Amino acid sequence: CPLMVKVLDAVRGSPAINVAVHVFRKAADDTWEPFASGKTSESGELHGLTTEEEFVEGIYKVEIDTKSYWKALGISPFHEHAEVVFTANDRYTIAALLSPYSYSTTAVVT
Amino acid sequence: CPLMVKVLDAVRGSPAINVAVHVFRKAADDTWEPFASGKTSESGELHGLTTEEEFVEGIYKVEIDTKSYWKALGISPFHEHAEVVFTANDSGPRRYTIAALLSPYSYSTTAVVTN
Numbered sequence: 328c329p330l331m332v333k334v335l336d337a338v339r340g341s342p343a344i345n346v347a348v349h350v351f352r353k354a355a356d357d358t359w360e361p362f363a364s365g366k367t368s369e370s371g372e373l374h375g376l377t378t379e380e381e382f383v384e385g386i387y388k389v390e391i392d393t394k395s396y397w398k399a400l401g402i403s404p405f406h407e408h409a410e411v412v413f414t415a416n417d418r419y420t421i422a423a424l425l426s427p428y429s430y431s432t433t434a435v436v437t
Numbered sequence: 438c439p440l441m442v443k444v445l446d447a448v449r450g451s452p453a454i455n456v457a458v459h460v461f462r463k464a465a466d467d468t469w470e471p472f473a474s475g476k477t478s479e480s481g482e483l484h485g486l487t488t489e490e491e492f493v494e495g496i497y498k499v500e501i502d503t504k505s506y507w508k509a510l511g512i513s514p515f516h517e518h519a520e521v522v523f524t525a526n527d528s529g530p531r532r533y534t535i536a537a538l539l540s541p542y543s544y545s546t547t548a549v550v551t552n
């Protein structure tokens with residue numbers, strides 16, 4: 328698994344479960360083309376997004392639907408979503424920690 | 438100002454100076470239209486982006502050019518940039534501070550919304 332996403336909830340101290348995550352790759356035309364997507368699991372993780380073969384060098388965007396997550400909890404959040412944009416240059420874990428008016432993200436590249 | 442941006446550097450323990458920031462607003466046809474831009478000052482702050490009049494309801498994207506910042510400092514960071522996307526002024530005018538704290542492989546952002 329060359330790409331994994333983990334999402335945590337900083338308010339409740341728990342995995343952020345059932346959060347939609349969409350991954351895009353930049354095409355030769357400056358636009359974002361769909362690449363991979365899923366919903367985080369009970370442990371706040373999303374695996375099986377891609378294969379080593381498909382995950383070539385490029386610029387990728389990981390979009391995390393944080394607004395839906397908070398709304399489902401009865402909480403009006405600030406951000407429309409959380410976006411993480413990076414170049415993959417030949418394992419990537421994109422981690423995100425969420426609060427209604429804040430988020431933090433880190434990359435663990437091993 | 439109704440929109441302010443503050444950027445700190447978690448590596449040096451300092452304001453992040455001369456960070457380019459571009460703000461876009463979502464148009465009716467769903468394109469990101471340029472709205473404003475600037476660079477952070479020696480205190481890591483960017484003021485004067487817009488006016489109460491021009492900062493109407495909408496979905497805004499504040500893009501902080503973190504890669505250009507780390508690259509101007511001679512190192513190669515992880516992210517291309519840090520984006521902050523939010524609906525603004527949908528229950529009347531508010532004042533927004535978008536704060537960001539930067540490291541080469543990580544960033545954090547928070548919003549302070551008043552009045």
Ligand SMILES: O=C(O)c1ccc2nc(-c3c(Cl)cccc3Cl)oc2c1
Binds near residue numbers: 431433
């Ligand atoms: O339990 C896990 O599997 C887990 C793995 C990685 C991780 N990173 C992290 C984090 C972020 Cl993303 C931003 C700011 C501060 C912290 Cl501590 O929390 C967290 C939890």
Ligand SMILES: O=C(O)c1ccc2nc(-c3c(Cl)cccc3Cl)oc2c1
Binds near residue numbers: 536537547
């Ligand atoms: O000195 C200032 O003017 C200053 C103002 C606001 C602010 N927020 C912040 C922050 C972020 Cl943005 C993310 C995670 C943790 C923290 Cl403490 O640092 C910081 C510094």
